[PDB]
Design a binder for these strands. Sequence first.
DNA 1: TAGGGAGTAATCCCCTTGGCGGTTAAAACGCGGGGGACAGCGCGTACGTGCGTTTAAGCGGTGCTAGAGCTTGCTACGACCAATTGAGCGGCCTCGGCACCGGGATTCTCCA
Length: 71
Amino acid sequence: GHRVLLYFQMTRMIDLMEEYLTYRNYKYCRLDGSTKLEDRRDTVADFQTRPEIFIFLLSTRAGGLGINLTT
DNA sequence: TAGGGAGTAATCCCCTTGGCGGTTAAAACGCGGGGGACAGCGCGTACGTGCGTTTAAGCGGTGCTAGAGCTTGCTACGACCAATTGAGCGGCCTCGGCACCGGGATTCTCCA
Ligand code: ALF
């Protein structure tokens, strides 16, 4: 039941990672420096709202600061 | 020895292209007929050809002097730059010019 944050230094890898995560059955969401600011609010609030999501795919720099991911 | 350039990838703002939907106005399609394209014809006059005349353009020659083209000397003036500011650009505001509409009046066409 360990909801989990994955940090990447490369954007192409977090693409490949969700190809793997969609080959498996893992429910995931994504935040990186290309996501637009309202999309960032929504994904952060989505992951922090509903326990259904398993993996937060998460960029090191854009996702590394300021936000709360305490769930 | 160190500073700043080379490499690279993430981050995030700007902006041009493309699609969806409607809807609506302009392009496409039809067809009658008219009148303008155009061929065919007559004349006449106006332009090309030819011949004799003249006129003056072009070539060979002489003489002159203006002025283009070059050298010299110097100082005036525009390039140059450091210090100063105010003219002119970028952003923001608003109101009045002008357009667009509607309906009543005058003009222009075309057929009788
Ligand atoms: F210091 Al933080 F999010 F960790 F502002």
